[PDB]
Amino acid sequence: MREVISIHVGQAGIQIGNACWELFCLEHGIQPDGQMPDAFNTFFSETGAGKHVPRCVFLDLEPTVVDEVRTGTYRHLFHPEQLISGKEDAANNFARGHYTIGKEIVDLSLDRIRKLADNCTGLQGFLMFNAVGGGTGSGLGCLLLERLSVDYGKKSKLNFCSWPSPQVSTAVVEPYNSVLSTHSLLEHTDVAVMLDNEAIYDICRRNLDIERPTYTNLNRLIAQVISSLTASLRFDGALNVDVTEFQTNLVPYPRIHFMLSSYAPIISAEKAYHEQLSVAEITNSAFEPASMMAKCDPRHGKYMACCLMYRGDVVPKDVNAAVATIKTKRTIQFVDWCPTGFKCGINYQPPTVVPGGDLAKVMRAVCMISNSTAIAEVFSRMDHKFDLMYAKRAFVHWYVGEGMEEGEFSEAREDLAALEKDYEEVGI
Amino acid sequence: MREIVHVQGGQCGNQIGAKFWEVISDEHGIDPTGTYCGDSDLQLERINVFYNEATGGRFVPRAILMDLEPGTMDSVRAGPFGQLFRPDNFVFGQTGAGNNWAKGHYTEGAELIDSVLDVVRKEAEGCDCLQGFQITHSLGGGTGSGMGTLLISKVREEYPDRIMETFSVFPSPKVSDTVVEPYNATLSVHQLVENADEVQVIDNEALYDICFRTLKLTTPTYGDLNHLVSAAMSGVTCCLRFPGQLNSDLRKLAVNLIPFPRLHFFLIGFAPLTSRGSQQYRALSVPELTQQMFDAKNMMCASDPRHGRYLTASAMFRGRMSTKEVDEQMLNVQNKNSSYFVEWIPNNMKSSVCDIPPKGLKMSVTFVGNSTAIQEMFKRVSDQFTAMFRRKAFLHWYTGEGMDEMEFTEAESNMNDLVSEYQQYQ
Amino acid sequence: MREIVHVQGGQCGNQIGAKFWEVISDEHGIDPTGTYCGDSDLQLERINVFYNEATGGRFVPRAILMDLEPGTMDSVRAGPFGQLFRPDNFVFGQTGAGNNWAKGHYTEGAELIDSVLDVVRKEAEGCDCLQGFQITHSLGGGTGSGMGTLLISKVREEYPDRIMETFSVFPSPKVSDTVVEPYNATLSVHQLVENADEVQVIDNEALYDICFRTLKLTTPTYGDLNHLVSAAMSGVTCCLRFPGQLNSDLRKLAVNLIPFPRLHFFLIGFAPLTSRGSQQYRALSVPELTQQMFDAKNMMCASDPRHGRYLTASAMFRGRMSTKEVDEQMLNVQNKNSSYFVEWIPNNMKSSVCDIPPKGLKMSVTFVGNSTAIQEMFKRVSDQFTAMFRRKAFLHWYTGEGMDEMEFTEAESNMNDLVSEYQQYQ
């Protein structure tokens, strides 16, 4: 009917997808076996006697993280050939993900995607989840998106990049992988949403009061953002929003599609005790500049287009009252050529809480996805890192011996330089 | 007799139209299952204006429900008074115009317009001679503003001399959804100034103002806002369905409001509108109706009427009421607030009296006025349009999808000419 | 017919005005639940002067309640006769003018006057034809003297020809609270002499004398003090509400007792006033009433009238009573006290007899006087003002809210000439 196809590439994609599919199963009330005891058709298919299989593919070059899904609780939820694993790791190399080992699994991946997409017309789009800091997430991510652009041309392609942090790295060669990925996802994606790890680290320190969080706590918060994004496809609402709606409403120029996301409220079970979660204050905390999910303070940018997804016990008059206060607040800055800069979407179904998680049951929530010119600094910062390391050719011999040519560094750098000049020209 | 064919387009149009059929069924005494109850001749004698006999004695609306996204049509069917509509009159789409006027009008609107136009012709040719068409849609969206205005163009080519009334909601002034509002609005107006006979403007923000300060309703949902618009929709067409002392149909309203064919944009008002607490305090009389109807605080357009002059205005009264106070109060409002009416028209006001009030009230009035204070709305859309167009912002979604750069310049030129024609009379 | 709109400002005004809605309520026989009890036509014939029908049979006061703190508004609704008022006639402030005339008139009152003038226009224009407005406030306070005097200026701009009868309670002669008394008094008076038609002054020191020496109460509360002032405030407008041998209105009193437009400050008195023990002992006659009426110890103004001359004076008698003894005693007092009257207006006295006395008496009188002994107040406030202005004490809050030094000099000059023009005719 209308459905969306999720692609998870890399270890980051898979572990985010594990949390994402746990939330989707619990909100529609299907058990890990796959059968519940037709609005939800957008994420699950039908296999005979009442039983539902997800519309996703898991892709990884190591066997490790995909075999651990295969032996977990969700053995029979996923189709056995939706979880594709290769033999050897890409090993933090962009060149390995495209030219050496990437070609052997992309053909098998496209066969699965074609079989899963030709059940219906009215395919809404694709969701990609990947890390640009890695080898297989960045390298094979590009190769799949080049292949998808050739076959499925006009379909909407949303990307969720787990972007490298300014301070915390967990890799040394990630400035190389990130600049090469951004060059090649610029001409392949429609909308790219920037997620940073240390942004969610600081959110969970102050809001959830978790001093020592893990990746499993991060991925729950990411899953709540995706749930709020695609809530309108699944549930009935007062003002619904599609997947194809974002590209008409958020991206003003073809190259400018890099955004910043936020979710509010993120409140603990003890913390909910004392607080009225009013529509006015959950929208104030969404725009509160410290509470971004990308570690870019939006005081040093201008907002260009902004999309608010209300979910829950939300009356439309309090949305209009709350967004008017934001516009009149003079520390929030808008670009001159975009006088009206809001899309509001309101859904009825409240956010579902995972048992034994860290979030509390809340009656209403906001997910905000905005385009701003503050993303200029997150591209300048890797560009400072990239020049400092490429100037005397560190780590280059791993890439050039692996199957790509010296010069793709130079081409990717000038493409990023072109993107930086584009953000500067749009602001003035 | 005479018939109105109803066409309901977009998510906004479908849920405004779903509650329209709730109020008209209630006033004609139709059970949601389609039967009649109420045992009165006056309800039933003129029912073919909105309904069709179905040889099982049930009445089916002459409504065509049209959308590109199958979500909102499921919602209308599942709700109360949802089993009333004919299932063949639903025309689904699969893809959805993502707030893009291009895909509403040109590319995805084209493959569905053949399907909807077949159904409209089946209903239109079915009667002796129909009176006209009424469309409820939105101009800030894609499928209401794009495909709804395409339908207006096609039906005016086929049936040129029939009346065409449009209940259209506009972008709100202050805070406003769907960031490409001025692209959608400006492109839809120039396709609607040439092809619609009377256009009646609604804002959501004006309706929120009404429900806060007059109705004193604490949590107004879109059910309550649509109920207010449906009240005004029934008041324009009272005289077709019920007898009265002075009848006025839609063409009577058209000949009496619009001096020049280019200017046909109307402000809509309804009275009385009182809170539950203040219902029992008020003297519900013709002088009170006329005071409440001439407020900026009561108009369902976000355009302050005292900043302009009323070119021509009309008041459709309902109930058992005395006609001299219908006449003398309309004289009273012209004389005392003399600065707000234009000079080269003597006796600007039109009155019609119908004998059947809405259910639960004793007397009501609906106001349709051609004001030149609607210049303020077209200037607000036009300067927002010129803000974005100079920088070529969000243009590649439109220009890449099968229109040209020149249609935007034509749209701005046609709407700036509409601004200029209003300015010469004030 | 004729209606008086009653408009209340400040904590003092609202506690004084709560007792007006007690003493008028029981004289017209209105139940605090809204209904009427007392089965007599004469109370009910002329009730639109202070009340409005509410189509439930209940009577709602024509009262406008305005304050900048909700604290005294909580007191009004909680007490007896507190359910009578319409809640929409209540208008609140949240911040409170902290005894600053500047923020009562300029800063805090600016955002609230738009709301309260809306409520007054709903009541004023809502009737057939209005007579006048009456105001209760203070001069010593911020929210009574600032926002109440701004309302007088704003409503005079809309309704120039209607009467204004105002109770302002003055700063105390001997000991006064609220250290900015002369800044609130002098700043209010120069706008009150240009915008008020009649002002009759009340002093708290005067009421302390009355309740001690005449009423012989050991513990006079402000419940009891406001009850005494409210008794006289019924008496000046009584003859509008009940028929009589010789009728009088406020405009009857206005044309007669103000000889020149600048001097319209009045003294009030009341008789009879005897203690609880001496109700059974005193012989209630018109000769004894006129002896109590021409006494400084009956006056509700803390002045000695024997130090000056009564320019013009008036006595509104109430009760079924013989008119000769009304007329001959007024002649008797003018012949005996030759030097206490002015010479070049012969027969200075006005009498009016209304036939229905207040409840619990058989005969009563309410006394107004335009005296030139009111120079004691204006000189006493002016030299307290002049002393505190010479070295610029407390000016920086009033300069802080957007005044100048020049408005203070004008305020002194406008009131200093008022002192001289009383002295000119003494």
Shortest distance between the Cα of C56 and any Cα of chain B, in A, equals 7
Shortest distance between the Cα of B334 and any Cα of chain A, in A, equals 36
- In whole angstroms, what is the distance from residue C270 CA to residue C367 CA? 6
Tell me the three-class secondary structure of chain A, residue by residue. CCEEEEEEEHHHHHHHHHHHHHHHHHHHCCCCCCECCCHHHHCECCECCCECCECEEEEECCCHHHHHHHCCCCCCCCCCCCEEECCCCCCCCHHHHHHHCCHHHHHHHHHHHHHHHCCCCCEEEEEEEECCCCCHHHHHHHHHHHHHHHHCCCCEEEEEEEECCCCCCCCCCHHHHHHHHHHHHCCCCCEEEEEEHHHHHHHHHHCCCCCCCCHHHHHHHHHHHHHHHCHHHHCCCCECCCCCHHHHHHCCCCCCCEEEEEEECCCCCCHHHHCCCCHHHHHHHHHCHHHCCCCCCHHHCCEEEEEEEEEECCCHHHHHHHHHHHHHCCCCCECCCCCCCEEEEEECCCCCCCCCCCCCCCCEEEEEEEEECCHHHHHHHHHHHHHHHHCCCCCHHHHHCCCCCCCHHHHHHHHHHHHHHHHHHHHC
Cα C208–Cα C211–Cα C214 angle in degrees, nearest 5: 125
- In whole angstroms, what is the distance from residue C36 CA to residue B286 CA? 29
Shortest distance between the Cα of B280 and any Cα of chain C, in A, equals 6
- In whole angstroms, what is the distance from residue A341 CA to residue A117 CA? 34
The alpha helices in B204-360, defined as continuous H runs, are 204-213, 222-236, 238-241, 250-257, 286-293, 323-336
Residue C252 tokens, joined: 């009857």
Q: Which of residues 5-24 of B touch A (CB under 8 A)?
A: 11
Q: Chains with 3 or more CB pairs closer than 8 angstroms to A? A: B
- In whole angstroms, what is the distance from residue C376 CA to residue C171 CA? 12
Could you tell me which of B74, B30, B80 has the C-alpha nearest to residue B51? B30
Residue B339 gets which letter from DSSP? G
Which residues does chain B have within 8 Å of residue A121's beta carbon, measured at their own beta carbons? 94
Q: Over the Cα atoms of chain B, what is R_g?
A: 21
The residue ranges of DSSP E strands in B285-411, in sequence order, are: 310-319, 349-354, 363-371
Residue B306 tokens, joined: 């005292």
- In whole angstroms, what is the distance from residue A265 CA to residue B25 CA? 43
Could you tell me which of C99, C24, C14, C114 has the C-alpha nearest to residue C64? C14
- In whole angstroms, what is the distance from residue C154 CA to residue A3 CA? 65
- DSSP, residue by residue, B79-92: STT-SSS-GGGEE-
- Return the amino acid letter for A1: M
Which residues does chain C have within 8 Å of residue B283's beta carbon, measured at their own beta carbons? 55
Could you tell me which of A348, B242, B295, A420 has the C-alpha nearest to residue C125? B295
Residue found by looking up tokens 């009917």 in the block = A1
| Distance linking the first and last C-alpha atoms of chain A | 44
Could you tell me which of C236, C229, C234 has the C-alpha nearest to residue C207? C229
- In whole angstroms, what is the distance from residue B127 CA to residue C128 CA? 53
From its phi and psi, is residue C393 left (phi > 0), alpha (psi between -120 and 50) or beta? beta
Instruction: Name the helix (H) or strand (E) containing B53.
Output: strand B51-53
Beta bridge partners of B61: B51
List C-alpha distances in Å: A415 to A252, A256, A260, A411, B247: 19, 13, 21, 6, 71
- In whole angstroms, what is the distance from residue B113 CA to residue A299 CA? 47
Q: Label the pairing between strands C163-169 and C51-53.
A: unpaired
Residue A297 tokens, joined: 């303070």
With a CB cutoff of 8 Å and minimum separation 6, the contacts of C157 are: none
Residue C413 tokens, joined: 């000059």
Long-range contacts of A17-22 (CB under 8 A, 24+ apart): A17/A56, A17/A58, A17/A129, A18/A69, A18/A74, A18/A219, A19/A216, A19/A219, A19/A220, A19/A222, A19/A223, A20/A129, A20/A219, A20/A222, A20/A223, A20/A226, A20/A227, A21/A54, A21/A56, A21/A74, A21/A77, A22/A74, A22/A223, A22/A354
Q: Label the pairing between strands A342-347 and A303-312.
A: parallel
Q: How many CB atoms lie within 10 A of CB B4?
A: 20
- In whole angstroms, what is the distance from residue C85 CA to residue C8 CA? 12
Residue C12 tokens, joined: 């003092």
Nearest CA in chain A to B98: A245
Q: Are C370 and C263 in contact (CB under 8 A)?
A: yes
B336: helix, strand or coil: helix
C6: helix, strand or coil: strand
CB contact under 8 A, B222 and A305: no
CB contact under 8 A, A239 and B387: no
Shortest distance between the Cα of C52 and any Cα of chain B, in A, equals 10
Catalytic pick among A22, A27, A68, A245: A245
Residue C49 tokens, joined: 């002067």
Give the number of B-C residue pairs with CB atoms closer than 8 Å: 10
Residue found by looking up tokens 């400035």 in the block = A175
Tell me the three-class secondary structure of C160-203, residue by residue. CCCEEEEEEECCCCCCCCCCCCHHHHHHHHHHHHHHCCEEEEEC
Residue C341 gets which letter from DSSP? B
How buried is B281 (Cβ within 10 angstroms: 0-12 exposed, 13-18 middle, 19+ buried)?
Answer: middle
Q: Over the Cα atoms of chain C, what is R_g?
A: 21
Which residues does chain B have within 8 Å of residue A342's beta carbon, measured at their own beta carbons? 175-177, 179
The phi, psi pair for C97, rounded to 5°, reads -80, 110
Q: Over the Cα atoms of chain A, what is R_g?
A: 21
- Rounded to the nearest 10 degrees, the angle between the axes of helix B204-213 and helix A316-328 is 110
Residue found by looking up tokens 């290769």 in the block = A86
With a CB cutoff of 8 Å and minimum separation 6, the contacts of C200 are: C165, C166, C167, C236, C265, C266, C267, C268, C368
C56 interface with B at CB cutoff 8 Å: yes
Residue B315 gets which letter from DSSP? E
Beta bridge partners of B91: B66
Q: Are B234 and B228 in contact (CB under 8 A)?
A: no
Q: Are B240 and B28 in contact (CB under 8 A)?
A: no
- In whole angstroms, what is the distance from residue C70 CA to residue C92 CA? 6
Could you tell me which of A194, A116, A178 has the C-alpha nearest to residue A148? A116
Residue found by looking up tokens 């299989």 in the block = A53
Q: Are B283 and B385 in contact (CB under 8 A)?
A: no
- In whole angstroms, what is the distance from residue B144 CA to residue B101 CA? 9
List C-alpha distances in Å: A124 to A45, A248, A286: 15, 14, 27
Residue A113 tokens, joined: 């995607």
With a CB cutoff of 8 Å and minimum separation 6, the contacts of B353 are: B244, B245, B246, B317, B318, B321, B323, B326
With a CB cutoff of 8 Å and minimum separation 6, the contacts of B160 are: none
Residue A248 tokens, joined: 């008409």
Residue found by looking up tokens 């203690």 in the block = C275
Beta bridge partners of C198: C165
Pick A338's closest partner by Cβ from B95, B96, B388. B388
The phi, psi pair for B346, rounded to 5°, reads -70, 145
Is A245 catalytic? The answer is: yes
In this structure, the dihedral spanned by the alpha carbons of residues C63, C68, C69 and C75, taken in order and rounded to 10 degrees, is -20
Nearest CA in chain B to C54: B281
User: What are the percentages of helix, strand and coil residues in chain C, rounded to 5?
Assistant: 45, 15, 40
Instruction: Name the helix (H) or strand (E) containing C370.
Output: strand C364-371
- In whole angstroms, what is the distance from residue B213 CA to residue B275 CA? 9
Instruction: Name the helix (H) or strand (E) containing C235.
Output: helix C222-235
Q: Are B333 and B294 in contact (CB under 8 A)?
A: yes
List C-alpha distances in Å: A398 to A50, A173, A393, A405: 51, 10, 11, 11
Could you tell me which of A29, A34, A84, A30 has the C-alpha nearest to residue A56? A84
- In whole angstroms, what is the distance from residue A410 CA to residue A397 CA? 15
C414: helix, strand or coil: helix
Residue B192 tokens, joined: 């609607």
Residue A162 tokens, joined: 């787990």
Pick A252's closest partner by Cβ from B211, B387, B393. B393
Q: Are A220 and A18 in contact (CB under 8 A)?
A: no
Instruction: Name the helix (H) or strand (E) containing B8.
Output: strand B4-9
Residue found by looking up tokens 């005395």 in the block = B322
Beta bridge partners of A262: A368
Residue B83 tokens, joined: 């089993």
Could you tell me which of A267, A253, A6 has the C-alpha nearest to residue A128? A6
C277 interface with B at CB cutoff 8 Å: no
Instruction: Name the helix (H) or strand (E) containing C323.
Output: helix C323-336
Q: Are B319 and B364 in contact (CB under 8 A)?
A: yes
B221 interface with A at CB cutoff 8 Å: yes
Residue found by looking up tokens 């074609």 in the block = A114
Could you tell me which of A257, A280, A258, A277 has the C-alpha nearest to residue A267? A277
Q: How many CB atoms lie within 10 A of CB C384?
A: 17
Residue B31 tokens, joined: 């059970």
Beta bridge partners of A347: A311
- In whole angstroms, what is the distance from residue A339 CA to residue A337 CA? 6
Residue C108 tokens, joined: 């805090």
- In whole angstroms, what is the distance from residue A200 CA to residue A293 CA? 6
- In whole angstroms, what is the distance from residue C148 CA to residue C139 CA? 9
Could you tell me which of B420, B419, B396 has the C-alpha nearest to residue B408? B396
Residue B135 tokens, joined: 């469309």
